[PDB]
CSV table of C-alpha atoms in Angstrom, one decimal:
chain,number,residue,atom,x,y,z
A,1,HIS,CA,0.0,0.0,0.0
A,2,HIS,CA,2.6,2.5,-1.1
A,3,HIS,CA,1.5,6.2,-0.8
A,4,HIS,CA,2.4,8.1,-3.9
A,5,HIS,CA,4.3,11.4,-4.0
B,1,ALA,CA,21.1,-20.7,1.4
B,2,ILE,CA,21.2,-17.5,-0.7
B,3,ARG,CA,19.0,-14.5,0.4
B,4,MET,CA,18.0,-12.1,-2.4
B,5,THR,CA,16.9,-8.5,-1.7
B,6,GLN,CA,15.5,-5.8,-3.8
B,7,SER,CA,15.4,-2.0,-3.5
B,8,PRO,CA,13.1,-0.2,-3.4
B,9,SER,CA,10.1,-2.3,-2.3
B,10,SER,CA,7.6,-0.2,-4.2
B,11,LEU,CA,8.0,3.0,-6.3
B,12,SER,CA,5.9,5.6,-8.1
B,13,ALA,CA,7.3,7.2,-11.3
B,14,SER,CA,6.1,9.5,-14.0
B,15,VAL,CA,5.3,8.4,-17.6
B,16,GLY,CA,8.4,8.8,-19.7
B,17,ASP,CA,11.0,8.5,-16.9
B,18,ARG,CA,13.6,5.8,-16.8
B,19,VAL,CA,13.2,3.6,-13.7
B,20,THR,CA,16.1,1.9,-11.9
B,21,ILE,CA,15.7,-1.0,-9.5
B,22,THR,CA,18.4,-2.9,-7.6
B,23,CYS,CA,18.8,-6.6,-6.6
B,24,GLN,CA,21.4,-7.9,-4.2
B,25,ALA,CA,22.6,-11.5,-3.2
B,26,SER,CA,23.8,-12.9,0.1
B,27,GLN,CA,26.8,-14.4,-1.5
B,28,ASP,CA,28.5,-14.1,-4.9
B,29,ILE,CA,26.3,-15.5,-7.6
B,30,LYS,CA,28.5,-14.3,-10.4
B,31,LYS,CA,26.2,-13.3,-13.3
B,32,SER,CA,23.6,-16.0,-12.8
B,33,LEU,CA,20.6,-13.7,-12.5
B,34,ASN,CA,17.3,-13.4,-14.3
B,35,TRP,CA,14.8,-10.5,-14.3
B,36,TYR,CA,11.1,-11.3,-14.6
B,37,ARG,CA,8.0,-9.1,-14.9
B,38,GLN,CA,4.6,-9.9,-13.7
B,39,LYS,CA,1.7,-7.7,-14.7
B,40,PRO,CA,-1.3,-7.7,-12.4
B,41,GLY,CA,-3.2,-11.0,-12.9
B,42,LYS,CA,-0.9,-12.4,-15.6
B,43,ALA,CA,1.9,-14.9,-15.3
B,44,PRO,CA,5.6,-13.9,-15.0
B,45,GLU,CA,7.5,-13.4,-18.2
B,46,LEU,CA,11.3,-13.4,-18.4
B,47,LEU,CA,12.8,-10.1,-19.5
B,48,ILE,CA,16.5,-10.5,-18.9
B,49,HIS,CA,18.8,-13.5,-18.5
B,50,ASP,CA,22.5,-13.8,-17.5
B,51,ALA,CA,22.3,-10.4,-15.7
B,52,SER,CA,22.5,-8.3,-18.8
B,53,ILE,CA,21.2,-10.1,-21.9
B,54,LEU,CA,17.7,-9.2,-23.3
B,55,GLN,CA,15.4,-12.2,-24.0
B,56,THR,CA,14.4,-13.1,-27.6
B,57,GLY,CA,11.1,-11.7,-28.7
B,58,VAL,CA,11.0,-9.0,-26.0
B,59,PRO,CA,11.3,-5.3,-27.0
B,60,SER,CA,14.3,-3.1,-26.4
B,61,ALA,CA,12.6,-1.3,-23.6
B,62,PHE,CA,14.7,-2.6,-20.7
B,63,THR,CA,18.4,-2.7,-19.9
B,64,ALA,CA,20.2,-4.6,-17.1
B,65,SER,CA,23.7,-4.9,-15.6
B,66,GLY,CA,25.5,-6.0,-12.5
B,67,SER,CA,27.8,-8.8,-11.2
B,68,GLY,CA,28.9,-10.4,-8.0
B,69,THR,CA,26.4,-9.2,-5.4
B,70,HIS,CA,24.9,-6.1,-7.0
B,71,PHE,CA,22.5,-6.0,-10.0
B,72,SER,CA,20.4,-3.3,-11.6
B,73,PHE,CA,17.4,-3.4,-13.9
B,74,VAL,CA,16.3,-0.3,-15.9
B,75,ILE,CA,13.1,0.6,-17.7
B,76,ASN,CA,14.3,3.0,-20.4
B,77,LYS,CA,11.1,5.0,-20.6
B,78,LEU,CA,8.1,4.1,-18.5
B,79,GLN,CA,4.6,3.6,-19.9
B,80,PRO,CA,1.2,2.9,-18.3
B,81,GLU,CA,1.4,-0.7,-19.4
B,82,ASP,CA,4.5,-1.4,-17.2
B,83,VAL,CA,2.7,-1.4,-13.9
B,84,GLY,CA,3.4,-4.6,-12.1
B,85,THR,CA,6.0,-6.4,-10.0
B,86,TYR,CA,9.6,-7.0,-11.1
B,87,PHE,CA,11.5,-10.0,-9.7
B,88,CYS,CA,15.1,-11.0,-9.7
B,89,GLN,CA,16.0,-14.7,-9.4
B,90,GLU,CA,19.3,-16.4,-8.8
B,91,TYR,CA,20.3,-19.7,-10.6
B,92,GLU,CA,23.7,-20.3,-9.1
B,93,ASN,CA,21.9,-22.7,-6.8
B,94,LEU,CA,19.5,-25.6,-7.2
B,95,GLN,CA,17.1,-23.5,-5.0
B,96,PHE,CA,16.4,-20.9,-7.7
B,97,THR,CA,15.4,-18.4,-5.0
B,98,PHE,CA,13.4,-15.4,-6.2
B,99,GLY,CA,13.6,-11.9,-4.9
B,100,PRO,CA,10.7,-10.4,-3.0
B,101,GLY,CA,9.6,-8.3,-6.0
B,102,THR,CA,9.6,-4.6,-6.8
B,103,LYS,CA,6.2,-3.0,-7.3
B,104,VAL,CA,6.1,-0.3,-10.0
B,105,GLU,CA,3.1,2.0,-10.2
B,106,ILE,CA,3.1,5.3,-12.1
B,107,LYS,CA,2.1,8.8,-10.9
B,108,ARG,CA,-0.5,10.8,-12.7
B,109,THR,CA,-2.7,13.8,-12.2
B,110,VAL,CA,-5.4,13.7,-9.5
B,111,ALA,CA,-8.7,12.2,-10.7
B,112,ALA,CA,-11.9,12.2,-8.6
B,113,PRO,CA,-14.0,9.0,-8.6
B,114,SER,CA,-17.3,8.5,-10.4
B,115,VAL,CA,-19.8,7.2,-7.8
B,116,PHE,CA,-22.5,4.7,-8.6
B,117,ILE,CA,-25.0,3.0,-6.3
B,118,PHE,CA,-26.9,-0.3,-7.0
B,119,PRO,CA,-29.8,-1.5,-4.9
B,120,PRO,CA,-30.3,-5.2,-4.0
B,121,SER,CA,-31.8,-7.2,-6.8
B,122,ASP,CA,-35.3,-8.7,-6.5
B,123,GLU,CA,-33.7,-12.1,-7.0
B,124,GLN,CA,-31.6,-11.8,-3.9
B,125,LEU,CA,-34.4,-10.7,-1.7
B,126,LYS,CA,-35.8,-14.1,-2.4
B,127,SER,CA,-32.9,-15.4,-0.4
B,128,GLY,CA,-33.6,-13.1,2.5
B,129,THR,CA,-30.5,-11.1,2.1
B,130,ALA,CA,-29.8,-7.6,0.6
B,131,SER,CA,-26.5,-6.4,-0.9
B,132,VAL,CA,-26.2,-2.7,-1.7
B,133,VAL,CA,-23.2,-2.0,-3.9
B,134,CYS,CA,-21.3,1.3,-4.1
B,135,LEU,CA,-18.8,1.8,-7.0
B,136,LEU,CA,-16.0,4.4,-7.1
B,137,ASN,CA,-14.8,4.4,-10.7
B,138,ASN,CA,-11.4,5.5,-12.1
B,139,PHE,CA,-9.9,7.8,-9.5
B,140,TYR,CA,-6.3,8.7,-8.5
B,141,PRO,CA,-4.6,8.6,-6.0
B,142,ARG,CA,-5.5,5.2,-4.5
B,143,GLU,CA,-6.7,6.6,-1.2
B,144,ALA,CA,-10.5,7.0,-0.9
B,145,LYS,CA,-13.0,6.5,1.8
B,146,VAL,CA,-16.6,5.1,1.6
B,147,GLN,CA,-19.1,5.4,4.3
B,148,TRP,CA,-22.6,3.7,4.3
B,149,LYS,CA,-25.6,5.5,5.8
B,150,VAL,CA,-29.0,4.1,6.3
B,151,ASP,CA,-31.7,6.6,7.2
B,152,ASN,CA,-28.7,8.9,7.7
B,153,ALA,CA,-27.2,6.5,10.3
B,154,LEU,CA,-23.6,5.4,9.9
B,155,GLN,CA,-22.9,1.7,9.5
B,156,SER,CA,-19.9,-0.3,10.8
B,157,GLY,CA,-18.9,-3.9,10.5
B,158,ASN,CA,-21.5,-4.9,7.8
B,159,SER,CA,-19.6,-3.8,4.7
B,160,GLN,CA,-16.5,-4.9,2.8
B,161,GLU,CA,-14.3,-3.1,0.3
B,162,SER,CA,-12.1,-4.2,-2.6
B,163,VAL,CA,-9.8,-2.2,-4.9
B,164,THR,CA,-8.5,-3.1,-8.3
B,165,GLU,CA,-4.9,-2.8,-9.3
B,166,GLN,CA,-3.7,0.3,-11.3
B,167,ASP,CA,-5.3,0.3,-14.7
B,168,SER,CA,-3.0,-0.5,-17.6
B,169,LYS,CA,-4.2,2.3,-19.8
B,170,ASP,CA,-5.2,5.3,-17.7
B,171,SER,CA,-3.5,4.4,-14.5
B,172,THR,CA,-6.5,4.9,-12.3
B,173,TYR,CA,-8.0,2.8,-9.4
B,174,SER,CA,-11.5,1.5,-8.8
B,175,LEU,CA,-13.2,0.5,-5.6
B,176,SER,CA,-16.2,-1.6,-4.9
B,177,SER,CA,-18.0,-1.6,-1.5
B,178,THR,CA,-20.7,-4.2,-0.6
B,179,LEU,CA,-23.1,-3.5,2.3
B,180,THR,CA,-24.9,-6.7,3.3
B,181,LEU,CA,-28.0,-6.8,5.6
B,182,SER,CA,-30.9,-9.2,6.0
B,183,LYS,CA,-34.0,-8.5,4.0
B,184,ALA,CA,-36.0,-8.2,7.2
B,185,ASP,CA,-34.1,-5.2,8.6
B,186,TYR,CA,-33.4,-4.0,5.0
B,187,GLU,CA,-37.2,-3.4,4.6
B,188,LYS,CA,-37.1,-1.7,8.1
B,189,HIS,CA,-35.4,1.4,6.6
B,190,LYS,CA,-36.0,3.7,3.7
B,191,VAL,CA,-33.0,5.7,2.3
B,192,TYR,CA,-29.7,4.0,1.5
B,193,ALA,CA,-26.7,6.1,0.7
B,194,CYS,CA,-22.9,5.8,0.2
B,195,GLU,CA,-20.8,8.9,0.9
B,196,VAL,CA,-17.4,9.1,-0.8
B,197,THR,CA,-14.4,11.2,0.3
B,198,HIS,CA,-11.5,11.6,-2.1
B,199,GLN,CA,-8.5,13.9,-2.5
B,200,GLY,CA,-10.2,15.3,-5.6
B,201,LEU,CA,-13.4,16.3,-3.9
B,202,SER,CA,-14.0,19.5,-2.0
B,203,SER,CA,-16.9,17.9,-0.2
B,204,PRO,CA,-18.1,14.3,0.1
B,205,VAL,CA,-20.2,12.9,-2.8
B,206,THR,CA,-23.3,11.1,-1.6
B,207,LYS,CA,-25.2,8.8,-4.0
B,208,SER,CA,-28.4,7.4,-2.6
B,209,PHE,CA,-31.7,5.7,-3.3
B,210,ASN,CA,-35.1,4.7,-1.8
B,211,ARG,CA,-36.7,1.3,-1.7
B,212,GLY,CA,-39.4,2.5,-4.1
C,1,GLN,CA,4.5,-21.3,-30.8
C,2,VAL,CA,5.9,-22.4,-27.4
C,3,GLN,CA,3.0,-23.3,-25.2
C,4,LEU,CA,2.7,-24.8,-21.7
C,5,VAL,CA,-0.8,-25.6,-20.4
C,6,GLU,CA,-1.5,-26.8,-16.8
C,7,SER,CA,-4.3,-29.0,-15.6
C,8,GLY,CA,-5.4,-31.1,-12.7
C,9,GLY,CA,-5.9,-28.4,-10.2
C,10,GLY,CA,-8.8,-28.1,-7.9
C,11,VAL,CA,-9.9,-28.6,-4.3
C,12,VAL,CA,-8.4,-31.4,-2.1
C,13,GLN,CA,-8.8,-32.4,1.6
C,14,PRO,CA,-5.8,-31.6,3.8
C,15,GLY,CA,-3.6,-34.6,3.9
C,16,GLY,CA,-5.1,-35.6,0.5
C,17,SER,CA,-3.5,-36.3,-2.8
C,18,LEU,CA,-3.6,-34.7,-6.2
C,19,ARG,CA,-1.5,-34.8,-9.4
C,20,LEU,CA,-0.9,-31.9,-11.8
C,21,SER,CA,-0.2,-32.2,-15.5
C,22,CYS,CA,1.5,-29.8,-17.9
C,23,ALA,CA,1.2,-30.3,-21.6
C,24,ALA,CA,4.1,-28.8,-23.6
C,25,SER,CA,4.2,-27.9,-27.3
C,26,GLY,CA,6.3,-25.9,-29.7
C,27,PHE,CA,9.8,-27.2,-28.7
C,28,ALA,CA,11.8,-30.3,-28.1
C,29,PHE,CA,10.4,-31.1,-24.7
C,30,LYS,CA,12.8,-33.9,-24.1
C,31,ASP,CA,15.8,-31.6,-24.5
C,32,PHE,CA,15.0,-29.2,-21.6
C,33,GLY,CA,14.5,-29.4,-17.9
C,34,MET,CA,11.3,-28.2,-16.5
C,35,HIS,CA,10.1,-26.5,-13.3
C,36,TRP,CA,7.1,-26.2,-11.1
C,37,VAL,CA,6.8,-22.8,-9.4
C,38,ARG,CA,4.0,-21.8,-7.1
C,39,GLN,CA,2.5,-18.5,-6.0
C,40,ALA,CA,0.4,-18.2,-2.8
C,41,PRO,CA,-2.6,-15.7,-2.9
C,42,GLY,CA,-0.7,-13.1,-0.9
C,43,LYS,CA,2.9,-13.9,-1.5
C,44,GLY,CA,5.5,-13.9,-4.3
C,45,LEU,CA,6.9,-16.5,-6.6
C,46,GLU,CA,8.5,-19.6,-5.0
C,47,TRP,CA,10.3,-22.4,-6.8
C,48,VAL,CA,8.9,-25.8,-6.0
C,49,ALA,CA,10.6,-28.5,-8.2
C,50,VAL,CA,12.8,-29.2,-11.2
C,51,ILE,CA,13.3,-32.2,-13.5
C,52,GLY,CA,16.4,-32.5,-15.7
C,53,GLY,CA,16.3,-32.6,-19.5
C,54,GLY,CA,18.0,-35.0,-21.9
C,55,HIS,CA,19.1,-38.5,-21.1
C,56,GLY,CA,19.1,-39.6,-17.4
C,57,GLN,CA,17.3,-39.0,-14.1
C,58,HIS,CA,17.7,-35.8,-12.0
C,59,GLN,CA,15.1,-34.1,-9.9
C,60,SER,CA,15.4,-31.5,-7.2
C,61,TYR,CA,13.0,-30.1,-4.6
C,62,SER,CA,12.6,-27.2,-2.2
C,63,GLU,CA,12.9,-27.7,1.5
C,64,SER,CA,9.2,-26.8,2.0
C,65,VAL,CA,8.3,-29.6,-0.5
C,66,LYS,CA,11.0,-32.3,-0.4
C,67,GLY,CA,9.9,-35.8,0.5
C,68,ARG,CA,6.2,-35.1,-0.1
C,69,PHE,CA,6.0,-34.1,-3.8
C,70,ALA,CA,7.4,-35.9,-6.8
C,71,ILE,CA,8.3,-34.4,-10.2
C,72,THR,CA,8.1,-36.8,-13.2
C,73,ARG,CA,7.8,-36.5,-17.0
C,74,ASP,CA,6.8,-38.4,-20.2
C,75,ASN,CA,8.8,-37.3,-23.2
C,76,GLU,CA,6.8,-39.4,-25.7
C,77,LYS,CA,3.6,-37.7,-24.4
C,78,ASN,CA,5.3,-34.3,-24.0
C,79,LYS,CA,4.0,-34.1,-20.5
C,80,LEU,CA,5.3,-32.9,-17.1
C,81,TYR,CA,3.8,-34.2,-13.9
C,82,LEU,CA,3.7,-33.0,-10.3
C,83,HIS,CA,2.5,-35.7,-7.9
C,84,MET,CA,1.4,-34.3,-4.5
C,85,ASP,CA,0.7,-36.2,-1.4
C,86,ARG,CA,0.3,-35.3,2.3
C,87,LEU,CA,-0.9,-31.8,1.2
C,88,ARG,CA,-0.9,-28.9,3.7
C,89,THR,CA,-2.7,-25.6,4.1
C,90,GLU,CA,0.5,-23.7,3.0
C,91,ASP,CA,0.4,-25.6,-0.3
C,92,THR,CA,-2.7,-23.7,-1.5
C,93,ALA,CA,-1.4,-21.8,-4.5
C,94,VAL,CA,-1.4,-21.2,-8.2
C,95,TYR,CA,1.1,-23.7,-9.8
C,96,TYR,CA,2.9,-22.7,-13.0
C,97,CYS,CA,4.9,-25.2,-15.0
C,98,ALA,CA,7.8,-23.5,-16.6
C,99,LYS,CA,10.6,-24.3,-19.2
C,100,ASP,CA,14.3,-24.0,-18.4
C,101,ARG,CA,16.5,-22.3,-21.0
C,102,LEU,CA,18.7,-25.5,-20.9
C,103,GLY,CA,18.7,-28.0,-18.1
C,104,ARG,CA,20.2,-31.0,-19.9
C,105,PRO,CA,23.3,-32.8,-18.4
C,106,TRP,CA,26.9,-33.0,-19.5
C,107,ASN,CA,29.5,-35.7,-18.7
C,108,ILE,CA,32.3,-33.5,-17.2
C,109,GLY,CA,35.3,-34.8,-15.3
C,110,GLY,CA,34.0,-38.3,-14.9
C,111,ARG,CA,30.8,-36.9,-13.4
C,112,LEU,CA,27.4,-36.0,-14.8
C,113,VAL,CA,26.6,-32.3,-14.4
C,114,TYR,CA,23.3,-30.5,-15.2
C,115,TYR,CA,23.2,-26.8,-16.1
C,116,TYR,CA,19.9,-25.1,-15.1
C,117,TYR,CA,19.5,-21.5,-16.1
C,118,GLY,CA,16.0,-20.6,-14.9
C,119,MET,CA,12.5,-20.4,-16.4
C,120,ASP,CA,12.0,-18.7,-19.8
C,121,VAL,CA,8.4,-19.7,-20.7
C,122,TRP,CA,5.5,-20.1,-18.3
C,123,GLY,CA,2.0,-21.5,-18.5
C,124,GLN,CA,-1.0,-19.6,-17.2
C,125,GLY,CA,-1.0,-21.7,-14.0
C,126,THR,CA,-3.5,-23.9,-12.2
C,127,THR,CA,-5.1,-23.3,-8.8
C,128,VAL,CA,-4.8,-25.9,-6.0
C,129,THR,CA,-6.9,-25.3,-2.9
C,130,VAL,CA,-6.5,-27.5,0.2
C,131,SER,CA,-9.4,-27.2,2.6
C,132,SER,CA,-12.0,-29.3,4.4
C,133,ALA,CA,-14.7,-26.8,3.6
C,134,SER,CA,-17.6,-27.5,1.3
C,135,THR,CA,-17.5,-26.3,-2.3
C,136,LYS,CA,-20.4,-23.9,-3.0
C,137,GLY,CA,-21.4,-22.5,-6.3
C,138,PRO,CA,-22.1,-18.7,-6.4
C,139,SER,CA,-25.4,-17.0,-6.7
C,140,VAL,CA,-25.2,-14.4,-9.4
C,141,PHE,CA,-27.3,-11.2,-9.2
C,142,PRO,CA,-27.5,-8.1,-11.5
C,143,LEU,CA,-26.3,-4.6,-10.8
C,144,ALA,CA,-28.8,-2.8,-13.0
C,145,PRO,CA,-27.9,0.5,-14.7
C,146,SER,CA,-30.0,3.4,-13.4
C,147,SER,CA,-32.0,5.6,-15.8
C,148,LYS,CA,-31.2,8.6,-13.7
C,149,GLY,CA,-23.7,10.2,-20.7
C,150,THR,CA,-21.8,7.3,-19.0
C,151,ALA,CA,-23.7,4.5,-17.3
C,152,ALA,CA,-22.3,1.7,-15.1
C,153,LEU,CA,-23.7,-1.8,-14.8
C,154,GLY,CA,-22.4,-5.0,-13.2
C,155,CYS,CA,-22.6,-8.5,-11.8
C,156,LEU,CA,-22.5,-9.5,-8.2
C,157,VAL,CA,-21.1,-13.0,-7.7
C,158,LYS,CA,-21.8,-14.0,-4.1
C,159,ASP,CA,-21.3,-16.9,-1.5
C,160,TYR,CA,-19.0,-19.2,-3.4
C,161,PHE,CA,-16.1,-21.4,-2.3
C,162,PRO,CA,-13.3,-21.6,-3.1
C,163,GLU,CA,-11.4,-19.3,-5.4
C,164,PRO,CA,-11.1,-18.6,-8.2
C,165,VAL,CA,-14.1,-17.3,-10.1
C,166,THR,CA,-13.7,-16.0,-13.7
C,167,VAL,CA,-16.1,-13.4,-15.1
C,168,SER,CA,-16.1,-12.1,-18.7
C,169,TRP,CA,-18.6,-9.9,-20.5
C,170,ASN,CA,-20.4,-10.7,-23.8
C,171,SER,CA,-18.2,-13.7,-24.2
C,172,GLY,CA,-15.0,-11.6,-24.3
C,173,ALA,CA,-16.2,-9.3,-27.0
C,174,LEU,CA,-16.5,-6.5,-24.4
C,175,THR,CA,-13.2,-5.7,-22.7
C,176,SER,CA,-13.0,-1.8,-22.4
C,177,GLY,CA,-14.3,-0.3,-19.2
C,178,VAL,CA,-14.5,-3.6,-17.4
C,179,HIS,CA,-13.3,-3.7,-13.8
C,180,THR,CA,-13.4,-7.1,-12.1
C,181,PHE,CA,-12.6,-6.5,-8.4
C,182,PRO,CA,-10.6,-8.7,-6.1
C,183,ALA,CA,-12.8,-11.2,-4.2
C,184,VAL,CA,-13.5,-10.6,-0.5
C,185,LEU,CA,-13.9,-13.4,2.1
C,186,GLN,CA,-16.9,-12.7,4.4
C,187,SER,CA,-17.4,-13.9,7.9
C,188,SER,CA,-19.5,-16.4,6.1
C,189,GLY,CA,-16.4,-18.3,5.1
C,190,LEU,CA,-17.6,-17.8,1.5
C,191,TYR,CA,-16.2,-15.4,-1.1
C,192,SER,CA,-17.9,-12.6,-2.9
C,193,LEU,CA,-16.8,-10.7,-6.0
C,194,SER,CA,-18.0,-7.9,-8.3
C,195,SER,CA,-17.6,-7.2,-12.0
C,196,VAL,CA,-18.4,-3.8,-13.4
C,197,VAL,CA,-18.4,-2.1,-16.8
C,198,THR,CA,-19.1,1.4,-18.0
C,199,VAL,CA,-21.0,2.0,-21.3
C,200,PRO,CA,-22.5,4.9,-23.2
C,201,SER,CA,-25.8,5.8,-21.7
C,202,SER,CA,-27.5,5.7,-25.1
C,203,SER,CA,-26.5,2.0,-25.3
C,204,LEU,CA,-28.7,0.8,-22.4
C,205,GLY,CA,-31.7,0.3,-24.7
C,206,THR,CA,-29.8,-0.7,-27.8
C,207,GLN,CA,-27.0,-2.9,-26.6
C,208,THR,CA,-27.3,-6.2,-24.7
C,209,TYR,CA,-24.9,-6.9,-21.8
C,210,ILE,CA,-24.4,-10.3,-20.1
C,211,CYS,CA,-21.9,-11.4,-17.5
C,212,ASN,CA,-20.5,-14.9,-18.0
C,213,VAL,CA,-19.3,-16.2,-14.6
C,214,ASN,CA,-17.5,-19.5,-14.2
C,215,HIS,CA,-16.9,-21.4,-10.9
C,216,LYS,CA,-15.1,-24.5,-12.0
C,217,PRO,CA,-14.9,-26.1,-8.5
C,218,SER,CA,-18.7,-26.1,-8.9
C,219,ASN,CA,-18.9,-26.6,-12.6
C,220,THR,CA,-21.2,-23.6,-12.7
C,221,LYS,CA,-21.4,-21.5,-15.9
C,222,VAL,CA,-23.9,-18.7,-15.5
C,223,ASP,CA,-24.9,-16.0,-18.1
C,224,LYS,CA,-26.9,-13.2,-16.4
C,225,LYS,CA,-27.9,-10.2,-18.5
C,226,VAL,CA,-28.3,-6.7,-16.9
C,227,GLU,CA,-31.4,-4.7,-17.9
C,228,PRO,CA,-32.6,-1.3,-16.6
């Protein structure tokens, strides 16, 4: 669940 | 016996950028390394073998290099179709141990979700259960919140969510929420609504219906 | 041209037995070693077993699998087999057969040595689910498009066990705008899934839309069409 920029 | 690591774990990049990912081995594995790609829901396909050589029939869209314990894999210019997970695997062993994978998503402009609401079908009310479905279509970024209300009363513990993977063409996400109740208490209330909060909405979007 | 097709997957009791087959075509199957690799529902790729190509016996296993699975082959039939006994909960996975780039042996230094170089072609994979739970076919309900211009309509596949369920639209003729969501496991112990598609709003009266859902542990094919 990587949070984008 | 050989532990393989990859960095980063997951990344976001812009379309047209060149993306570099690294693989490392516990011990020297010489140049016995392969690079695989797995698009969401498809099987792996081998992109690079013997550390640096491109596989036959695959386009010249990737480069790779490395030796000993350090290896690098590069997408020359990233495209929306390249979302997925990139694995390295060693074959200096008879264990053929894979790396943990590197997840590649792509960053795009903010897009607010399109909300739809679907009432329980007449067929399912035969069964005595009622499933109301809320759909959040083609949004970005991935974070979004759905809240179910019945007669303007918030619900908890009786709904479940699911999110698709990043779309291969327009790089958006979609979410489906299912609110399940029994027909008996379903017919006890009148208005059913799903309220959506997203980074692209100034205020929550409420889509709702009545049993009639 | 080079094709690997898996078969034999399905549900099996824990401690039960099951055998997987992999039909190969488009290359000299006898001349290459072959692998079985598995992928759990929430984990990465994990190598399971290998059989050597050419003339003579060589098979190798992973620690998680050694002594309980067997890898065999039939070069006349162009077939690869994975015999599975004593199966465990952790064995629940999608199983790919895969071709090695080489894998045949060489007589070197008075010894026989095999050179495996990893997988270069994979099949689509077959799902093996180990559980004591009952297999249940899904009930399929429409998600009708509202007449209240883009419209959304879908298919709710509910209370089935186990995974996986396949859903297509208009027998594969309709692919754009389709979003089949990951399945969710309810407190029920049974799965539920949704398949959605967006269409021009004009099309609701003109164009027919049917979801084609398959649950092959059930042998249930259902075609349900979505009307306003």
